């Protein structure tokens, strides 16, 4: 029983975090095999970050302009290249702690664990969702650039995020491990801001199922709705439209609880129209949207507290 | 910016988790140096758990009745003894991944990270607080017994919790690493239940400071209160009394934000009397009490967004 915002165990990623310094700029890198991946902004002075030409800045650098430290050992950079917004620093030592890994780009509405790191030293781990507007509501301070987000499946680490910057609203923006930004953001100093966001409806429904699995049903009702009728209410409350694929994804949770997906939609519609009336669901007074159907299935018992 | 329920990086603990089997019962153990620590309930059949005499059950066991597996390697048990509610299985191999560690018992109101584990394999990591009633609101399924809770300070792992059982309300109970239960609970099948709980007032105040540090002040007011006048309101809302030591602990947060502790108490008093009026604080619609002053200082910038 219980339901928590649960991250994946971070050890496999901890063994990959290093410190990268170029000039007076220091940030985190990811050491996999004989390559260290880090944000290309490491080559910029704060003067440069306003209007940087990264190709022009990088051609003026040599391998020995890059200082990479893994704990107490200094790794020798033997090559360097830029791929989109990341630098790839080839080093003379392959990381003996390299896990099985993939570079995967995630979809808005999906979740991942973040290992917050400073000066190559891991500080904390937490769960995040990619927002519909391609920002993440992370927790990051100066020095966290290059921290990574990931999921783990059968000892294989799927890296999906590298942290780059904080936006004026305090939310965060970054790239996949190929250096391609999530959303309309750039690694330069501009007035860029997060666009309008929405609530991840399929995740809210999954979380309502999580509450039922743990033995709570107070928000349920005898009503049902059509997919079209629910989406008309969802649009009014800034919720994303629900698709038939979303209904199919919620199938296993619907079967375990005996509550049809469109029946749970009727419950959500009532919760949106009436609020919670002083009550809580899984310890929250808001409708939580940062748990995917997979997250619920992974954490909740396979047997419902009937 | 941002504020998340952030756990410590779990790698140092992952390298210590093993599987312990005795008869048909399997759970998790903690392998430090040449000793494996696990709940003594591993020696019980489910028949035994109603009224077990553990000394009588243990004397009937030999070293070879205990099967310990660390990944794929089986460790040979060369000794065994019981200390309170934990078993200590001496093995013939010292764990080469043993971190610097301590066995510390925590106080109600303090926080720790939990590495949820099943069959000796870590599954997830999350933050928990020890409740005033000595339960934890964890997330645990069958097979999680022996999972541990910990804090990390300068590469030293302070182990503070080993998981034992789930109570009828879905909350969790366990011991320190010396096998002594937190709270009035026992490792046998009884009608035991969680006692009445309260809200951790000092943590709520710390969390309000965290909100101010990140740039939010909507809940503040021009009023102040005396420590006695606040505690009269705290008692009515099932909040713990605030001590002068608590005020002293909040000193650094009060100085960083320029908000006197008794001024923040006035804000909390108003929030308790009037609710939030549809507004949120740090993404929550409830007053959060599972962040300590230390947790806030560790995660928040040292500079307040003025």
Author numbering:
A (entry chain A), B (entry chain A): 1 to 306
What text comes from the article?
Mpro is a cysteine protease that cleaves at no less than 11 sites on the replicase polyproteins. Initially, Mpro releases itself from the polyproteins through autocleavage. Then the mature Mpro forms a functional homodimer and transcleaves pp1a and pp1ab. Given its essential role in the viral life cycle and the absence of closely related homologs in the human genome, Mpro is considered an attractive target for anti-CoV drug development (12–14).
The complex structure is similar to that of the mutant alone with an rmsd of 0.259 Å for all Cα atoms. The substrate binding pocket in the complex structure is slightly expanded compared with that in the apo mutant structure.
